């Protein structure tokens, strides 16, 4: 597997829920970058060097993903709920002396990020979320058109071992299909082949695949419930937030993203990027510039 | 080896312009066509067809593309596997037997053929029974988080090929057994005859058969939904006397009852819950058979 972060260090961070793997480079204010599905920390490899000129950049594998440890799940999918993931990454950052930090997340990692900002807003200086709406909003918009577009939200949340057994026959096909289907071009041309290999190797482990399903199970159940409480209680993210989304991404397929986030966040600014779902790889310079400007 | 679960029924290959329909045929009297759904074949009627065959000429058909029926070549609109096209093909098949006016009971996908047949060609039916469904339009119109999780396969199997085909290939025996078990009241395979399960497992083992099923669900997401919408909008109702049966823990039921739904779609509908999961003729064969004989007699 290639090293896609030349000059970045590597850290194995112990937490109460297992080790978090991260690449660390740069200097300045701490900035935690979180990937999503079906990727690993290396999806940031085109944006992180730009960010490292101005920030101390911590590029972490989510709990259970990549090279982070995989806590054993349970019937409520607890360690893979975004609430638990957020708490574990807070501990990880505390291990490095970062009790107040900026955070950008993509996809699942963006869900960890906004839940972190709802649960523990005093930990964040600023927050950026890339190509998502809150989990609640997706489920509340789950009509025929959206159920067909993000079918995997309900497929991967089926009880174990149904998705796991199906994914196990040809894992390579499914991870490449998901990467391709969500890009603007609809193929793998936007990705560094070395990055794809990272994603494919991670997906080839059945325990990693199970964790991803647990993530999606949490996404259908506990994550939705946590979000529901906040939206119905009128709880808003108080941290200044940036919402970036791909013109051809997932978030815009169910609503106008800024309008949605303004219901969730008191101080949110937003921009589309001509891109599919994978903004830091499909539009690295555009994304990096938006992030550098926002966090500066 | 596959068990004969209809002792005393003949086996017919019925030619149509779209391919052969396989059927078991037994009994004498007025014709009654029985249609199965997914992931099954005609053998799902094996516990109720003998009781029906006491009073009717019972034709137990594999749906086009399913079981031993031929598989017409699909197209980008999944036309042969739209319920409109399946209904037309089954009408042709019954015509080959001289049945232009018949009774019809369908379960699952076969019930969707059945009510589309009733909307498109109600003059062909004396009476109609649908088992544990609501119209396709109603499922998609109800689509929310709860329904999306419960009938996830409606959107999973409708994904563009080869995605569901490739995934189903990952463990087909598990998938078909998982669908059978998860939709019963018991939650396991104990309601089924093991010889019937073998029929279902073998049919599901064929990748071409699995592709057909995906074509059926693709139709269900697209053309079938559009055909239903036209009837909702036009206010077209089924005018054939109709029975809607559903499982206490089947599919069609939420806290709103399938009968209230079907009365929007049908002018003359009676209905009854059966203590059963989705697979009424196998989980609850005596109760299902009684309801059907009473209605059709």
From Swiss-Prot, chain A:
GO MF term set: haloacetate dehalogenase activity
Feature type site, description Important for enzyme activity: 131
Coiled coil: none
Catalytically driven reaction(s): a haloacetate + H2O = a halide anion + glycolate + H(+); fluoroacetate + H2O = fluoride + glycolate + H(+); chloroacetate + H2O = glycolate + chloride + H(+)
Effect of residue 152 to N: Reduced catalytic rate with fluoroacetate, but increased catalytic rate with chloroacetate. Minor effect on substrate affinity
Keywords, ordered alphabetically: Hydrolase
InterPro entries the record matches: AB_hydrolase_1 (IPR000073), AB_hydrolase_fold (IPR029058), Epox_hydrolase-like (IPR000639)
DNA damage in keyword set: no
Binding site for fluoroacetate: 108, 111, 152-153, 216
Residue ranges of domain AB hydrolase-1 in the record: 29-267
Enzyme Commission designation: 3.8.1.3
Signal peptide: none
Keyword Transferase: no
Phenotype upon changing residue 216 to F: Reduced catalytic rate. Minor effect on substrate affinity
Active site: 107, 277
Source organism, top-level taxon: Bacteria
Known function: Catalyzes the hydrolytic defluorination of fluoroacetate to produce glycolate. Has lower activity towards chloroacetate and bromoacetate.
Subunit structure: Homodimer.
Family stated for the protein in its record: Belongs to the AB hydrolase superfamily. Epoxide hydrolase family.
Protein name as it appears in the record: Fluoroacetate dehalogenase
Organism: Rhodopseudomonas palustris (strain ATCC BAA-98 / CGA009)
From Swiss-Prot, chain B:
Active site (catalytic residues): 108 (nucleophile), 278 (proton acceptor)
Catalytic activity line of the entry: a haloacetate + H2O = a halide anion + glycolate + H(+); fluoroacetate + H2O = fluoride + glycolate + H(+); chloroacetate + H2O = glycolate + chloride + H(+)
Molecular functions per Gene Ontology: haloacetate dehalogenase activity
Protein's UniProt keywords contain S-adenosyl-L-methionine: no
Annotated site (Important for enzyme activity): 132
Amino acids binding fluoroacetate: 109, 112, 153-154, 217
Keywords: Hydrolase
Entry EC no(s): 3.8.1.3
Gene3D superfamilies: alpha/beta hydrolase
Keyword Transcription: no
Top-level taxon of origin: Bacteria
Consequence of changing residue 108 to N: Loss of enzyme activity
AB hydrolase-1 domain residues: 30-268
Family statement drawn from the similarity comment of this UniProt entry: Belongs to the AB hydrolase superfamily. Epoxide hydrolase family.
PANTHER family given in the database record: EPOXIDE HYDROLASE (PTHR43329)
Subunit structure of this chain's protein: Homodimer.
Function: Catalyzes the hydrolytic defluorination of fluoroacetate to produce glycolate. Has lower activity towards chloroacetate and bromoacetate.
Protein name: Fluoroacetate dehalogenase
Organism for this UniProt entry: Rhodopseudomonas palustris (strain ATCC BAA-98 / CGA009)
